[PDB]
């Protein structure tokens, strides 16, 4: 079966990046890497989770950080 934890493994790497991109210190990332991981996940059709995972990660940042500062301003 295609089931495996590696799906989570790429999740993180894609996730730690996205968080970093939102954290505005992009210098530590690589486009070639990132595109491939995102690519492989959807290739064996787990995108509907990755899209969902995408929805959460950005949602996390705005509400938890962006919303706070605008309140503080």
């Amino acid at each position: 079966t295609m089931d495996e934890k590696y799906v989570n493994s790429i999740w993180d790497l894609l996730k730690n990046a996205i968080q970093e991109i939102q954290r505005k210190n992009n210098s530590g990332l690589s486009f070639e890497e990132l595109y491939r991981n995102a690519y492989t996940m959807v290739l064996h059709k787990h995108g509907e989770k990755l899209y969902t995972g995408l929805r959460e990660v950005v949602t996390e940042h705005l509400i938890n950080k962006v919303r706070e500062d605008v309140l503080n301003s």
């Binding site: 992009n26 990332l29 690589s30 486009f31 070639e32 990132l34 595109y35 491939r36």
Partner: protein, 114 residues
């Protein structure tokens, strides 16, 4: 200096040299993204100055061929799906479109009956 007109690819270990415009037929494509001089993603530069793309070094021929002359150039022994699985990656749909027809065209004879 800070910019140049030639981009050097290290696809799969083999090296390619091509022009920026060569990487701009489809500006949604992976190749286009590297072609940009944005500092937002450092990319995977190599000491040779090449951009380390880590997919098949060989099936990249037909992909870059279309990115210079807009037609399906396949070495006879190369595998049609080979470029397709390569074309999907770089995100140039037009080649991906015509590739599928070439496969379907292939089977009109290879799937025929007497």
């Amino acid at each position: 200096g800070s910019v140049s007109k030639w981009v050097r690819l290290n696809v799969g270990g083999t090296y390619f040299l091509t022009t920026r415009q060569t990487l701009c037929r489809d500006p949604k494509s992976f190749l286009y993204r590297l072609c940009q001089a944005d500092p937002d993603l450092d990319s995977d530069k190599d000491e040779t100055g090449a951009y380390l793309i880590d997919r098949d070094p060989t099936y990249f021929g037909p992909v870059l061929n279309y990115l210079r002359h807009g037609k399906l150039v396949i070495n006879k022994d190369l595998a049609e799906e080979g470029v397709l699985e390569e074309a999907e990656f770089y995100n140039i749909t037009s080649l991906i479109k015509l590739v599928k027809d070439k496969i379907r065209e292939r089977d009109s004879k290879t799937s025929q009956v007497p």
